């Protein structure tokens, strides 16, 4: 479709610090690719981001009931909504699946790779550590980082550069809020 | 000092399509959206709807204001249309793939605008729709969108897969391939 498009987009954002001790509320407006005006609860009034938003800064700051609604949002909206879904969002805990498999370097390098795949977990914060004969490996540890699956789950692949010897025991160890004890998967050459 | 969590109410209205969306996002995940055609709240995971509620009428009333605001902003901009930004497309699996153990292909579409796409899943060059699912248009810290499409499948050495993405910023539909390794 070659037809020109026109987009109006808004985000009302609630940023939470130390539970709900401090809340920062942002009411943002975008026309096409441009953020033109916003209300920041720290500021206390609307402010134009660009020239395009100057008429709204002037007009919305003069709308008494609207500005007070925005000023009350941290409690009536942010803190309210935080509490509504708290049990299944903030307190959501989904335990990981830990899979260990060797992988060949392409083309062959001096080392091969040992993959620790940690999947299907929630929240995103995780600790994945490689061990060789009960000693942590800091060198040769490569990760593509935290991958969001878009379905309230995350995954991560943590690789260890290895020179695999006859009787070496490799251990991937996972710590995550969903589990009280470190999870381990052993691999032998 | 860093924030622990973010809750976003994201909404848009788009002309000439006359399409709009209203959704809530928690740390990058869709909690729910409003089905505009059915005038109903659609929960991302069924358990959410057992624990919380949302009146769709409020989203519908906001969408009508978003539409009025689009008309005002379109005139104020001197009728400037959007410049299309094509998406980055990544295809991954939910977990490492094992032969004949069901798995899920994930097509992640990111950093694009306007929020309009046509997404097709291709198995050996053929369209497949069995058990497919998707998110609505998800917010980013910028003016850009993200979206996920899902295809559950039984892994085999024979079958190949493609996620075909159409966007107005793309000269030709973008195909991202996946096939079983070794």
């Amino acid at each position: 479709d070659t037809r020109p498009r026109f987009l109006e987009y808004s985000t009302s954002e609630c940023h939470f610090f130390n539970g709900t001790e401090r809340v920062r509320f942002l009411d943002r407006y975008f026309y096409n690719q441009e953020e033109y005006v916003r209300f920041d609860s720290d500021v206390g009034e609307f402010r134009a981001v660009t020239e395009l938003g100057r008429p709204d800064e002037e007009y919305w700051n003069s709308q008494k009931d609207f500005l007070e609604d925005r000023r009350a949002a941290v409690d009536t909206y942010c803190r309210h909504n935080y509490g509504v879904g708290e049990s299944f969002t903030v307190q959501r805990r989904v335990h990981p699946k830990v899979t260990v498999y060797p992988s060949k370097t392409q083309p062959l390098q001096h080392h091969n790779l040992l993959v620790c795949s940690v999947s299907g977990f929630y929240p995103g914060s995780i600790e994945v550590r490689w061990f060789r004969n009960g000693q942590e490996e800091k060198t040769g540890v490569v990760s593509t980082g935290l991958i969001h699956n878009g379905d309230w789950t995350f995954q991560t692949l943590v690789m260890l550069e290895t020179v695999p010897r006859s009787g070496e025991v490799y251990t991937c160890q996972v710590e995550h809020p969903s589990v009280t004890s470190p999870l381990t998967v052993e691999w032998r050459a | 000092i860093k924030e622990e969590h973010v809750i976003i109410q994201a909404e848009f209205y788009l002309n000439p399509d006359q399409s709009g969306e209203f959704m809530f996002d928690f740390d990058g995940d869709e909690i729910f959206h409003v089905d505009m055609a059915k005038k109903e709240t659609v929960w991302r995971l069924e358990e959410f709807g057992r624990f919380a509620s949302f009146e769709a009428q409020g989203a519908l009333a906001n969408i009508a204001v978003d539409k009025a605001n689009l008309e005002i902003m379109t005139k104020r901009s001197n009728y400037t249309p959007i410049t299309n930004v094509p998406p980055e497309v990544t295809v991954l699996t939910n977990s490492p793939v094992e032969l004949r153990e069901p798995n899920v292909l994930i097509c992640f579409i990111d950093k694009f605008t306007p929020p309009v796409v046509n997404v097709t899943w291709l198995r050996n060059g053929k369209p497949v729709t069995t058990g497919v699912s998707e998110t609505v248009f998800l917010p980013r810290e910028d003016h850009l969108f993200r979206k996920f499409h899902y295809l559950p499948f039984l892994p085999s050495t024979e079958d190949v897969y493609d996620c075909r993405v159409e966007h107005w910023g793309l000269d030709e539909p973008l195909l991202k391939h996946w096939e079983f390794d070794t």
């Binding site: 919305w60 309210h80 509504v84 | 109410q9 729910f32 409020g58 906001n62 605001n69 005002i72």
Partner: peptide, 13 residues
């Protein structure tokens, strides 16, 4: 419990 909508307001015409 109900999620609350933050109500939209018409822009300056």
């Amino acid at each position: 419990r109900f999620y609350k909508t933050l109500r939209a307001e018409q822009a300056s015409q």
